Amino acid sequence: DVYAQEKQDFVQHFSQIVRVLTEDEMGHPEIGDAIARLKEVLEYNAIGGKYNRGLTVVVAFRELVEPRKQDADSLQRAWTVGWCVELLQAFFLVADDIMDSSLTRRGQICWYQKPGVGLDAINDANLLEACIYRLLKLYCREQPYYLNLIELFLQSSYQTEIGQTLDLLTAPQGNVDLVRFTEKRYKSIVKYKTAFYSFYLPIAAAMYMAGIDGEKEHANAKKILLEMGEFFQIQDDYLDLFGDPSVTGKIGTDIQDNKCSWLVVQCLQRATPEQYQILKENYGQKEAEKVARVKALYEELDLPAVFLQYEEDSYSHIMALIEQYAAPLPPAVFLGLARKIYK
Amino acid sequence: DVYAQEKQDFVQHFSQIVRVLTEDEMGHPEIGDAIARLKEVLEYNAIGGKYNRGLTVVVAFRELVEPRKQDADSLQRAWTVGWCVELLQAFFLVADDIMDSSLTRRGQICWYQKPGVGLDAINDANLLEACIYRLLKLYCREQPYYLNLIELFLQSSYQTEIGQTLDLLTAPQGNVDLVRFTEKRYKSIVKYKTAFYSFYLPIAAAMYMAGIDGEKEHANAKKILLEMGEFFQIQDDYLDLFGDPSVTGKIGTDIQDNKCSWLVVQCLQRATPEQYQILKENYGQKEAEKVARVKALYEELDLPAVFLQYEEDSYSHIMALIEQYAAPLPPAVFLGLARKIYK
Ligand SMILES: O=C(O)Cc1c(C(=O)O)[nH]c2c(Cl)ccc(Cl)c12
Ligand SMILES: O=C(O)Cc1c(C(=O)O)[nH]c2c(Cl)ccc(Cl)c12
Ligand SMILES: O=C(O)Cc1c(C(=O)O)[nH]c2c(Cl)ccc(Cl)c12
Numbered sequence A, B: 001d002v003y004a005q006e007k008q009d010f011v012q013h014f015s016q017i018v019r020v021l022t023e024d025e026m027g028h029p030e031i032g033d034a035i036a037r038l039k040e041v042l043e044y045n046a047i048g049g050k051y052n053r054g055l056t057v058v059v060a061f062r063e064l065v066e067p068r069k070q071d072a073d074s075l076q077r078a079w080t081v082g083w084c085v086e087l088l089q090a091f092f093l094v095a096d097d098i099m100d101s102s103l104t105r106r107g108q109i110c111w112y113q114k115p116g117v118g119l120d121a122i123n124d125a126n127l128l129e130a131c132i133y134r135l136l137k138l139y140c141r142e143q144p145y146y147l148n149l150i151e152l153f154l155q156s157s158y159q160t161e162i163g164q165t166l167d168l169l170t171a172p173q174g175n176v177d178l179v180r181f182t183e184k185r186y187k188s189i190v191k192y193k194t195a196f197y198s199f200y201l202p203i204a205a206a207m208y209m210a211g212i213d214g215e216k217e218h219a220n221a222k223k224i225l226l227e228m229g230e231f232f233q234i235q236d237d238y239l240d241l242f243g244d245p246s247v248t249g250k251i252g253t254d255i256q257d258n259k260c261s262w263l264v265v266q267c268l269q270r271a272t273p274e275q276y277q278i279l280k281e282n283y284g285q286k287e288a289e290k291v292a293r294v295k296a297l298y299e300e301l302d303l304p305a306v307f308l309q310y311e312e313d314s315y316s317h318i319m320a321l322i323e324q325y326a327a328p329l330p331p332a333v334f335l336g337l338a339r340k341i342y343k
């Protein structure tokens, strides 16, 4: 297990990441209390997830860079850039939890819900974002792929924020409007809000650190990764309700949160005037009774089988995509990810 | 009036800035509704201020770059980078208004207070930030000072966010604690939260676009600009209460908002046990009666004269700083700014 094993080396590097970020506090004792708050923000929000995005950078790096060019320093940079992706993720989650008024994250109370934090979490989120560029400058300033990485992280933030904008417009809190839950909107939200930074960013970062800055190579990798990103979110949506909490480790809340889920989009394409009514009067509700009604309608429309068939077609398509666009990159780079997400 | 005149050319460029930013909507009709929201965010938040930060970039550019190297394209880039500073300012203001629960900005209702916006303004703020880098890439990608500007804008955001962190820790909303309102804390907040991006960033940007990337030249300019930034905020604090609304165009709210103002810091250094009590039981209050009490105490401690004497000493110091660190830059670059802020 490239992940399960390399995971230990990644997480252990975090302590060094924090140290380096809270080091400028030296020659500037004036901002000491600010640096202390930053450390607290980092420890609370960058730790606790699965680190799949960051680990992907490392895994892809090792497979893309010849073993003789994998010096202690090159690997040092790999872990750092990987942690940068985790900081981007933390920047997003802290801000997103505020915007949808979530109560918990990773099973723990949302950072902004903490007593004494509140809306100050908005500035905390921005600090997480800024740490990304601080780390890149500190570890890759002299590297030839420095500018490429800066532009990639900036582009990934923009794409994601654009996707968040689409999502906010699509599912306005306190206003259930199933009318805008179209398949085209859903695919656009997934592509911009999730796919780009979760699947393309990590590999693309590793590609640049390996010297693979070709626009065509990046365009081909993106073609594959965005499709995998699309499947990931669709499977994530499906599991949110039909998944086993004992295996998933979480309880679904998409229905209650009136999210533009793949399930609701598919349910809206197969629903009849009467079914639609039930969905319109039960979606976005917290009462278990109303949620159960939604889930009942989904099963009736046999959405679970629809997804089963979708996963099989998606997998075949991804293999074909890999078979066609992987080269000159080692197929393993993509196959490794596919094996992980296709459960 | 370099400003009053050049101001027209700057503001008129905004329409082009918006056009270029909402142009990617072409090959991506999918994010059309998102791009429409972005345009609305830009128009509402980037317009309405005084544009002094952005105009400084242009003014400094013209004085630093020989007239024969000021082609239509170079000037185009100048206006753009100047507008980037205004986007940074808009990113900050939108977020700061949310964090301190302000009602209005530039006399109009705060963006987040608008019906249908609310906490979504958090993502809108991030989009404003992202547009900065989109413009730099679109206009300065091929320029030799491209990376310098990216790093400067990133560094300026970090400094500012750090200053915001210090400020939040110093004046926690709903918790008046005059104890932490020290002169050293105040100076640190001003330096990081205001001085760097308001005075150093604009000139430093112009310096890079002129080829002046010397670390020593930048270090000397910073020495001057941070001191001017410090005076600016101190005078801004003083005018917030003792200024004439007919001339300032705004009503003071620092006392009501429990801000770490220069006035309160000075009042805490000259106040007696009994005076301190009055301040402790009237600062951060909205009732006009309580505010009037604070203002009364300030006058008694003759703070207005203290400021008058401070402005004169500050001006002499700045001239000496210019006299010493301006070269090889034209003193006019700094004198122009000094004439504007020293009223
Ligand atoms: O970590 C996650 O939240 C989802 C996730 C899983 C996974 O669940 O196995 N795996 C991932 C990989 Cl390999 C790349 C990127 C992402 Cl986002 C993931
Ligand atoms: O989504 C929500 O409104 C609140 C909420 C959160 C949460 O915010 O973490 N988690 C929930 C779970 Cl696990 C079950 C049912 C509900 Cl209502 C919630
Ligand atoms: O525009 C402002 O809010 C304050 C301000 C004034 C001014 O008030 O004259 N002038 C400025 C200059 Cl020249 C450079 C940077 C800044 Cl912030 C300012």
Ligand SMILES: O=C(O)Cc1c(C(=O)O)[nH]c2c(Cl)ccc(Cl)c12
Residues within 6 Å of the ligand: B101, B102, B103, B104, B105, B251, B252, B253, B256, B257, B286
């Ligand atoms: O600062 C505040 O609490 C609200 C507030 C704002 C404002 O938020 O724009 N403006 C004010 C003025 Cl002009 C006078 C007195 C108060 Cl109380 C305020």
